RNA sequence: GUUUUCGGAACUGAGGCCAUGAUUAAGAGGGACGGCCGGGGGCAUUCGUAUUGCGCCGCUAGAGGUGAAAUUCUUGGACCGGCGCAAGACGGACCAGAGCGAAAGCAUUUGCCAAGAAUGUUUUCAUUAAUCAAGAACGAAAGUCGGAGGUUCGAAGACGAUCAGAUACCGUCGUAGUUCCGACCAUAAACGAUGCCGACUGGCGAUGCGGCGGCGUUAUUCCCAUGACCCGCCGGGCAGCUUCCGGGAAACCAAAGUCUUUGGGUUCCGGGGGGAGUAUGGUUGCAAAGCUGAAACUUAAAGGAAUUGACGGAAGGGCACCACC
RNA sequence: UAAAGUUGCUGCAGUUAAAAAGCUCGUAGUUGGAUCUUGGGAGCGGCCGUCCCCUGCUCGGCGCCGGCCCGAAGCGUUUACUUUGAAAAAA
C-alpha cells in the first residue's frame, strides 16, 4: 500500500526541521540514493560512494560526478562547450 | 439556373469536377507502356508511381516520384493505355 | 541510414541464424561461420580490439554499431543487453550487402 | 474530418467502376501471389506490397486479379505479421516520440503529440481485440513497447 | 458524422424545393429512401426519380414538381400504436384533408391511411405535405 | 449361458458431394507511401544595431526635462563628437484583414531532433466512428518557491510640479519584477463575447498551400526539364465583397439560414434584478487563491437593439460688436 | 392547477438581453454509412382493385389403384416493435 500521502524518503525526519526544508531535501535525497545506469557496462549499478564519487558495482569503475546527482547540469554544458572549442581550434 | 440535367452531365464539365464529386466516382490516373531508349522491352508503370522504378538490366531510371504525376525520363517512349 | 540497420536487424532476428553474446560469437568467428559482426559502441576497448583482430583473421567484416549494448539489445528484439553479435546467415536480409 | 486534428481534408484513392482485370495485365492469379510471396519474405508490410505491385507490374487491384486481398493472401500462407501493420506503425511512432522526449523534456508539444498517438493506439487495440486479432490480455505498455520495433 | 441517412435525403430535397430546383441529387441511397420516395411519388408530390447505382451507396436524382410543401423526418423512429396515430397526425399534419405520415410496419413502408386499412402500426419515419 | 441380425446412445477411420464458406471499399475513419509546405515545437549555434556603463581623445558651458518649470547632471569637464571595451535585453523596417499551432501562442542566421495539416494516390485495414459525466495533458500576464543574471523598463517608495487638496495624471530617481534554469499557480474582454461532428441552400474578385492543364515572356544556355511571371481548373485554408436565400427585437448573419411547415447526432449551460460568486461545508495550493456553492432579506424593474431630441473640455463647415480682435 | 412555449418530451433559450467549459484528450452514457427476395400465376369488377400459392419431416376415412388425396398431434435463430386473444376487484 501507499504508506505516506506526500512525504517520501524524508518521512524518517518525522516532524522536524520544518516543511520547506523537509521538502527541498527530498528532491536531493532521492537523487543521491538512486542507482544510475553505468554508461560503461550498461547495468543499473552506478551508486554514490562518497560526495562527488560514483562507483559502478558491476564494472568496478569509479567516476567523479556531482555531489547529489551523477551529472551536474553545469558540467554537461561544459563538456559540450569544450567539445566545440576543441574541434574549433584544431579545425 | 434552376433546370439542369444531372442525369446527363456534359463531359467538358465532368472532367472538371473532383474525382469523388463526379456523378460516378472515377480516377484521374492511368497506366503507361514505357520503352526507354537504352533497351527495347516495354514496362507497365503507373501515372503517379510514387516509387522509383528501374529498367531491366539496370539500364536507366524511368520515373521520379513527385507530388503528383511521376516525372518520366526524357527520351523514353510511353503510350497511355486503358482497360 | 541507422534505421535501415534496425530494419535489417529485425529482419534477421525473425529469419536468419544469429548468435548473441561474446563467448558464443567468438566461436563462430573461429569456426568461420560468421559473416558479419556487430559491436555496441560501449564495448570494452580491449574486447572490441580483439574481435576486430579475430575478424581480420577470418576476413569477415565488422559493423561498429552506434548505440550501446542496451539499445543494441532492443534492436535485436531482446529484453537483455547485447554487446556483440554475429550473423551466421541472414536468410532473407540485405544486411551483408551494405 | 481527422479525428486528432482540425483538418477536414478530402483526399484519397478512387477505384474505377469496372471491377474487371485490366486488358493489358498478363499476370495470372497464381503468379501475382508468388510475387506477393517474395516481397513478403524479404520484409514488407501489406500496404507497400500493393504500391510496388501497381507501379512495376501494373496490377490495378489485387482483389480483382485474384479473389482475395493482400493481407488475406499472406495470412492463408502464414506469412502475415502477427500484430497489424497500422498498430505496428503507431507503436513505432510512439516509441520514436517518446525517445525524443526523454532528452527534450521542455518540448510540451511533443508531450501533447504523445497523448494523441497513444490515444490512437488504445483505440485500435480495443478494436483488434473485439475482432479477436489480438489476445484479450494484450496491452501496449510504453516500457516494453520498444522491443517491438 | 452522418448518423441518419433518411434525414440528409429529405432536408436536401426540401431545401432544393424552396429554392425551386427542377431536380435534386441526394448523395447516399438506402433501401428505406427509395421506399420513402415511392410513397411520395404515388401521391404526386414528386416526379420521376432515378437511382444511379454504382458499386457503392448509390445516388438518386429526384425530379421535383412544385407540389411539395415540406417533407420532414421524425427522429428517432418512435413506435406508433393505432390508438395514438390519430394524435400524431393531429399535431404533425397541416389539416385533415391532405398530408401523409410515412411509417414503417411489418407489412412494409406506407402512409398512415394504408396503415389504417391494414390495421397495423409501427415505427414512424417522416411526413410530407 | 453365449453371440448377433435387431432399435437406440457414443466414438473412431476412409470418402462422396456443395456453384464447397469471406458483400462492398463510404465525397466515414485509421495507417502506409510521394514530393512539397509552414514566425509549429525542442536543443545548440550565429548575427544585428540600439541602450546603459567604463577607458581614452577633442572642444567646450550648460545639459536634461516640461504646457511652463523644478527635482537631477555639470569647469572634480556634464551634454556633444571620435575610437575602443564590457554586459544584459530585444529581434526594427521587410510584416500583410499572409502563414503555422488544440488553445495559450509563434519572426536574425545556420545545424540537429521528433512531429504535423493540406494535396497526390486504380496502396492497406474494413466500421475501427461522433459527441462526451469521471479522469488527464497544455494553458498569456501577474503572482509564488529555489538557483543564475541584473541593460532597459518599472508596481512599491522617495522627490519635483500641478491643484482648493493629488497620497493621481506630468517630471527625476528607483525596489520587487521584467531575462534565464528548475518547480508551483490554472486564471484573462483566455473574444468570433458565437460548442463539436455531418448534410444542404446564391453569386464575385482575390489570397495561401498542394495538384492538373495551357499561348507566350524571362532565367541554366544547349534545349527538354525546372524556377520567376501569365490564363484557367480541383481540393481546404484565413478572409472579403455583393444580394429580398432565409432568419432576426433589431444591429446584423452564406450563417446567427434550412424553426409553430417546430425532431440529423451529441456535450455544456441560462430562468426578473439584487443579496452573491457572498456565507458555510468539502477539496486543491507554499501562499495568493482556484473549483464546488446557498439562504434570510430586498426589489418593479434591471436589461437589449433601434429612433427623435438635448448635451459634449468631439470633429467638420458657417455666423453675431447683446461675441472677440 | 391552467394561464406558463416563464422548466419547453410534444415545445424554450445561450453573437450583443440571463447564458458555450481557455483548449484538447478521454472512460461510462448517448448515437451510429451502405449492403442479403422480388416477381409471376388462377379467379372477379370498370391497363387498374381483391383473394390464394411459392412452406419441410406420428396417427386416421370420401378413399382409390408401394403411391396419392385429406384430417389431427410434434418440430422448425432469438429479442425489440406491431396486431390479436386471454387473464385482468368493485366504487
From Swiss-Prot, chain A:
Gene3D superfamilies: 2.20.25.30. One of its GO terms (biological process) is translation. It is found in: Cytoplasm. GO terms for molecular function: large ribosomal subunit rRNA binding; structural constituent of ribosome; zinc ion binding. InterPro entries: Ribosomal_eL37/eL43, Ribosomal_eL43, Ribosomal_zn-bd. Keywords: Cytoplasm, Metal-binding, Ribonucleoprotein, Ribosomal protein, Zinc, Zinc-finger. Zn(2+) binds at residues 38, 41, 56, 59. Pfam families: Ribosomal_L37ae. HAMAP family: Ribosomal_eL43. PANTHER family: 60S RIBOSOMAL PROTEIN L37A, 60S RIBOSOMAL PROTEIN L43. Belongs to the eukaryotic ribosomal protein eL43 family. Component of the large ribosomal subunit. Component of the large ribosomal subunit. The ribosome is a large ribonucleoprotein complex responsible for the synthesis of proteins in the cell. This is Large ribosomal subunit protein eL43. The gene is RPL37A.
UniProtKB/Swiss-Prot annotation, chain C:
The modification N6-acetyllysine is found at residue 17. Keywords: Acetylation, Cytoplasm, Isopeptide bond, Phosphoprotein, Ribonucleoprotein, Ribosomal protein, Ubl conjugation. It is found in: Cytoplasm. GO terms for molecular function: RNA binding; structural constituent of ribosome. GO terms for biological process: antimicrobial humoral immune response mediated by antimicrobial peptide; cytoplasmic translation; defense response to Gram-negative bacterium; killing of cells of another organism. InterPro entries: Ribosomal_eL30, Ribosomal_eL30-like, Ribosomal_eL30-like_sf, Ribosomal_eL30_CS, Ribosomal_eL8/eL30/eS12/Gad45. One of its GO terms (cellular component) is cytosolic large ribosomal subunit. The keyword Zinc does not apply. There is a cross-link at residue 17 (Glycyl lysine isopeptide (Lys-Gly) (interchain with G-Cter in SUMO2)). The modification Phosphoserine is found at residues 1, 7. Component of the large ribosomal subunit. NCBIfam families: PRK01018.1. Component of the large ribosomal subunit. The ribosome is a large ribonucleoprotein complex responsible for the synthesis of proteins in the cell. Belongs to the eukaryotic ribosomal protein eL30 family. This is Large ribosomal subunit protein eL30. It comes from Oryctolagus cuniculus (Rabbit). The lineage of its organism: Eukaryota, Metazoa, Chordata, Craniata, Vertebrata.
Swiss-Prot record, chain D:
CDD domains: Ribosomal_S15p_S13e (cd00353). InterPro entries: Ribosomal_uS15, Ribosomal_uS15_arc_euk, Ribosomal_uS15_N, uS15_NS1_RNA-bd_sf. There is a cross-link at residue 42 (Glycyl lysine isopeptide (Lys-Gly) (interchain with G-Cter in SUMO2)). Ubiquitinated at Lys-26 by RNF14 and RNF25 in response to ribosome collisions (ribosome stalling). GO terms for molecular function: small ribosomal subunit rRNA binding; structural constituent of ribosome. The modification Phosphoserine is found at residue 29. The modification N6-succinyllysine is found at residues 26, 33. One of its GO terms (cellular component) is cytosolic small ribosomal subunit. Keywords: Acetylation, Cytoplasm, Isopeptide bond, Nucleus, Phosphoprotein, Ribonucleoprotein, Ribosomal protein, Ubl conjugation. It is found in: Cytoplasm; Nucleus, Nucleolus. There is a cross-link at residue 26 (Glycyl lysine isopeptide (Lys-Gly) (interchain with G-Cter in ubiquitin)). HAMAP family: Ribosomal_uS15_A. NCBIfam families: PRK08561.1. Belongs to the universal ribosomal protein uS15 family. This is Small ribosomal subunit protein uS15.
Curated annotation (Swiss-Prot), chain E:
It comes from the Eukaryota. GO terms for biological process: translation. Component of the 40S ribosomal subunit. Part of the small subunit (SSU) processome, composed of more than 70 proteins and the RNA chaperone small nucleolar RNA (snoRNA) U3. GO terms for molecular function: structural constituent of ribosome. This is Small ribosomal subunit protein uS8. Keywords: Cytoplasm, Nucleus, Ribonucleoprotein, Ribosomal protein. It is found in: Cytoplasm; Nucleus, Nucleolus. PANTHER family: 40S RIBOSOMAL PROTEIN S15A. Pfam families: Ribosomal_S8. It comes from Oryctolagus cuniculus.
Amino acid at each position: 500500500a501507499k504508506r505516506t500521502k506526500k512525504v517520501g524518503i524524508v518521512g524518517k525526519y518525522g516532524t522536524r526541521y520544518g516543511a520547506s526544508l523537509r521538502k527541498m531535501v527530498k528532491k536531493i535525497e532521492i537523487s543521491q540514493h538512486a542507482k544510475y545506469t553505468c554508461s560503461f557496462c550498461g547495468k543499473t549499478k552506478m551508486k554514490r560512494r562518497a560526495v562527488g564519487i560514483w562507483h559502478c558495482g558491476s564494472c568496478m569503475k569509479t567516476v567523479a560526478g556531482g555531489a547529489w546527482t551523477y551529472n551536474t547540469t553545469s558540467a554537461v554544458t561544459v563538456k559540450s562547450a569544450i567539445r566545440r572549442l576543441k574541434e574549433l581550434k584544431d579545425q | 439556373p434552376l433546370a439542369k440535367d444531372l442525369l446527363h452531365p456534359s463531359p467538358e464539365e465532368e472532367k472538371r469536377k473532383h474525382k469523388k464529386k463526379r456523378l460516378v466516382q472515377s480516377p484521374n490516373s492511368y497506366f503507361m507502356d514505357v520503352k526507354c531508349p537504352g533497351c527495347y522491352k516495354i514496362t507497365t508503370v503507373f501515372s503517379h508511381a510514387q516509387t522509383v522504378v528501374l529498367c531491366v538490366g539496370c539500364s536507366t531510371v524511368l520515373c521520379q516520384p513527385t507530388g503528383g504525376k511521376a516525372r518520366l525520363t526524357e527520351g523514353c517512349s510511353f503510350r497511355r493505355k486503358q482497360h | 541510414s541507422l534505421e535501415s540497420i534496425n530494419s535489417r536487424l529485425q529482419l534477421v532476428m525473425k529469419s536468419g541464424k544469429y548468435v548473441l553474446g561474446y563467448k558464443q560469437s567468438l566461436k563462430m568467428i573461429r569456426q568461420g561461420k560468421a559473416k558479419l559482426v556487430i559491436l555496441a559502441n560501449n564495448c570494452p576497448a580491449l574486447r572490441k580490439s580483439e574481435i576486430e583482430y579475430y575478424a581480420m583473421l577470418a576476413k569477415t567484416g565488422v559493423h561498429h554499431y552506434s548505440g550501446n549494448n542496451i539499445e543494441l539489445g532492443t534492436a535485436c528484439g531482446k529484453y537483455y543487453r547485447v554487446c556483440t553479435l554475429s550473423i551466421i546467415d541472414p536468410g532473407d536480409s540485405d544486411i551483408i550487402r551494405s | 474530418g481527422r479525428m486528432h486534428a482540425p483538418g477536414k481534408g478530402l483526399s484519397q484513392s478512387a477505384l474505377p467502376y469496372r471491377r474487371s482485370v485490366p486488358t493489358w495485365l498478363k499476370l495470372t492469379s497464381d503468379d501475382v501471389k508468388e510475387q506477393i510471396y517474395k516481397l513478403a519474405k524479404k520484409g514488407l508490410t501489406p500496404s507497400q506490397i500493393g504500391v510496388i505491385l501497381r507501379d512495376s507490374h501494373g496490377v490495378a487491384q489485387v482483389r480483382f486479379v485474384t479473389g482475395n486481398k493482400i493481407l488475406r493472401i499472406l495470412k492463408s500462407k502464414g506469412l502475415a505479421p502477427d500484430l497489424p501493420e497500422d498498430l505496428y506503425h503507431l507503436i513505432k511512432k510512439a516509441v520514436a516520440v517518446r525517445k525524443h522526449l526523454e532528452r527534450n523534456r521542455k518540448d510540451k508539444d511533443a508531450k501533447f503529440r504523445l497523448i494523441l498517438i497513444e490515444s490512437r493506439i488504445h483505440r485500435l487495440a480495443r478494436y483488434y481485440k473485439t475482432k479477436r486479432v489480438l489476445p484479450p490480455n494484450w496491452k501496449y505498455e510504453s516500457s516494453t513497447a520498444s522491443a517491438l520495433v | 458524422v452522418r448518423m441518419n441517412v433518411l434525414a440528409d435525403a429529405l432536408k436536401s430535397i426540401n431545401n432544393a424545393e424552396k429554392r425551386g430546383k427542377r431536380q435534386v441529387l441526394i448523395r447516399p441511397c438506402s433501401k428505406v429512401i427509395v421506399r420513402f420516395l415511392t410513397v411520395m411519388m404515388k401521391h404526386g408530390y414528386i416526379g420521376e426519380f432515378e437511382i444511379i447505382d454504382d458499386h457503392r451507396a448509390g445516388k438518386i436524382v429526384v425530379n421535383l414538381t412544385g407540389r411539395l410543401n415540406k417533407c420532414g423526418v421524425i427522429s428517432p423512429r418512435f413506435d406508433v400504436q393505432l390508438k395514438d396515430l390519430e394524435k400524431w397526425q393531429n399535431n404533425l399534419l397541416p389539416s385533415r384533408q391532405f398530408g401523409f405520415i410515412v411509417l414503417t410496419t411489418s407489412a412494409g413502408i406506407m402512409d398512415h391511411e394504408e396503415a389504417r386499412r391494414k390495421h397495423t402500426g409501427g415505427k414512424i419515419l417522416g411526413f410530407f405535405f
